[PDB]
């Protein structure tokens, strides 16, 4: 009964705009659901997970992949890699021993080959068949997968879910939106037949002259029903139990997602507590809170109540991690890597203690001696710690002259530098004019004076069709005679500017 | 001084007594002529009428 006070509050707020107040009102709505409450909520979660486990378990071929990709990872004669870290790892309520894998996979494949026999015997869901399927499921229930492959497999299930839904949607569009067929009879016929066009021609048998007018789309209706069937024969698993498994997995996922919300919304206050020992570091209070909240979500995911420990310890550990790692990833204009941030903070702590021990700020020699690392890295890290100062800071005490008004743009060309290099261009043009055509051309192409690009020796040798060092000789001759003082006097002067 | 009391006993003052001179801050000193030498430059703080 908190929204019945928030009603009066929002009706009589003081035109509040601060997101701190809006958040702190809403995180205060949900009450502390801890101790007994937390354990109950934790059980609502594992029940949803186990329902999803079972829903995967009735589908056999997904288990195939379990043995398939495992036989893939074992395929290369020896492995204990990420993929194996992703397979079962049965948690008995470390170093991987593949003998255990073979031991636990032999009986699984034995159940594989024994359950299928009764699936065909006297009926798809025969009593003996149903009992053997239940035995298979019970055996599989103790295989607690590593989360990554588990999510991959539930993906491999929901892909079939969504393709079934989308094919049904496509057929529903193509039928109802164009031919205007009633869905009321469709539902019953689809549940009844589901496999053949007996219901199609049957509903058309009812006079309905509009039902006759489907010839232009006849070749498309049962052609799409062909794909709808092909889905079922590819699965080889009947549609009604597909829907049952779909509902089971949906409800199982919704249970856990609903349960985790109470845990998060109850421990928001814990998040706010840890986040407040972290302010004045670059990130605002609500920035530190929202990183804490993500850390809390992780903690709720990884929490195990069977350990018998209080939840707040685990949550505290993850929340502090998220907050102090984000305050390092962000909160700096020039991003400092996390480990360098940690080293800087080592220097700050050690500087404090040496400061109070000595009575002076320590010199980098003594500081290096204390922190046990060379003075080079000490001085480097000290130079790193500086953060950009503000440009709009008032270098004038009044609001007259800011810092950014004094920052020269040191990329522009100083005008009178040889008349922005025009004088040199003109003088070169003049001097090259005094030379013979071939020398001038090759000289230009070589260095590039007023040329597209600076054709190298090879390129210019191609240009005049001489595959030799005639060009090199020519350039040597040219460069030679443009040092002769009588030929170049004006040009020589710019050099020693 | 850091005094530590015991919360079981009512005012069990002598559970820990800890005396240690601590260094907190440096305070600039005034010269004999009413000025401070701050960052090598000689500064004056003017009185305020409030």
């Amino acid at each position: 009964a908190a929204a019945q006070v928030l009603s009066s509050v929002e009706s009589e707020i003081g035109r509040t705009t601060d997101p701190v107040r809006m958040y702190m009102r809403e995180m205060g709505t949900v009450e502390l659901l801890t101790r007994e409450g937390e354990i109950d909520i934790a059980k609502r979660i594992e029940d949803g997970i186990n329902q999803v486990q079972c829903s995967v378990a009735e589908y056999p071929e997904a288990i195939t992949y379990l043995l398939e990709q495992y036989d893939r990872v074992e395929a290369e004669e020896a492995r204990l890699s990420d993929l194996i870290t992703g397979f079962v790892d049965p948690n008995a309520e470390n170093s991987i021993d593949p003998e255990l894998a073979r031991e636990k996979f032999a009986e699984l494949r034995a159940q594989y080959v024994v359950t299928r026999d009764t699936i065909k015997a006297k009926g798809r869901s025969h009593a003996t068949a149903q009992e053997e399927i239940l035995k298979l499921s019970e055996v599989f229930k103790q295989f607690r997968l590593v989360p990554k492959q588990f999510d991959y497999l539930v993906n491999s299930m929901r892909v079939m879910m969504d393709r079934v839904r989308t094919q049904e949607r496509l057929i529903m569009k193509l039928c109802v939106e164009q031919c205007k067929m009633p869905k009321k009879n469709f539902i019953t016929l689809f549940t009844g037949n589901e496999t053949s066009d007996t219901w199609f021609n049957a509903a058309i048998a009812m006079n309905k002259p509009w039902s006759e007018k489907l010839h232009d789309v006849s070749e498309e209706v049962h052609r799409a029903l062909q794909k709808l069937q092909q889905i079922e024969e590819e699965t080889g698993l009947t549609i009604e139990q597909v829907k049952d498994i779909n509902r089971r997995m949906s409800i199982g996922e919704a249970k856990a997602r609903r349960a985790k919300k109470e845990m998060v919304e109850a421990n928001l206050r814990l998040v706010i507590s840890i986040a407040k020992k972290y302010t004045n570091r670059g990130l605002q209070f609500l920035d530190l809170i929202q990183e804490g909240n993500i850390g809390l979500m992780k903690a709720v995911d990884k929490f195990e109540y069977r350990r018998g420990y209080k939840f707040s310890t685990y949550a505290t550990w993850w929340i502090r991690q998220a907050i102090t790692r984000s305050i390092a990833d962000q909160a700096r204009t020039i991003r400092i890597p996390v480990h360098m941030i940690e080293t800087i903070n080592k220097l700050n702590r050690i500087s404090r203690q040496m400061l109070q021990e000595m009575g002076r700020e320590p010199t980098p020699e003594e500081l290096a001696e204390r922190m046990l690392m060379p003075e080079d890295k000490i001085r480097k890290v000290l130079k790193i710690a500086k953060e950009p100062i503000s440009m709009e800071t008032p270098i004038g005490d009044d609001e007259d002259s800011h810092l950014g008004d004094f920052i020269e743009d040191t990329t522009l060309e100083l005008p009178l530098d040889s008349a922005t290099t025009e004088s040199l261009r003109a003088a070169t043009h003049d001097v090259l004019a005094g030379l013979t055509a071939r020398e001038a051309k090759v000289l230009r192409m070589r260095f590039g004076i007023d040329m597209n690009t600076d054709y190298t020796l090879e390129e210019v040798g191609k240009q005049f069709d001489v595959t030799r060092e005639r060009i090199r000789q020519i350039e040597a001759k040219a460069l030679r005679k443009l040092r002769h003082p009588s030929r170049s006097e004006v040009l020589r002067s710019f050099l020693d500017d | 001084r850091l005094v530590i009391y015991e919360r079981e006993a009512p005012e069990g003052t002598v559970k820990d007594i800890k005396e240690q001179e601590v260094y907190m801050g440096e305070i600039p000193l005034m010269t004999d002529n009413g000025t401070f030498v701050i960052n090598g430059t000689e500064r004056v703080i003017v009185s305020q009428l409030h």
Binding site: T363, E365, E375, T421, L424, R425, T428, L443, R446, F447, G448, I449, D450, M451, D454, A478, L479, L482, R483, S488, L491, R492, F494, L495 | -
Partner: protein
Amino acid sequence: TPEEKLLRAIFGEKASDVKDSSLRVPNGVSGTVIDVQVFTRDGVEKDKRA
């Protein structure tokens, strides 16, 4: 620019890899250097005049 390329490849004069940023008297000022002070870190060799 290509033209400086030609200029340095004709008179054979490649500029040094060291630019000058020497301190010089601001323009329009005369005077008499009356004092020079050199400050060096603790860990850098002192040049001759220091």
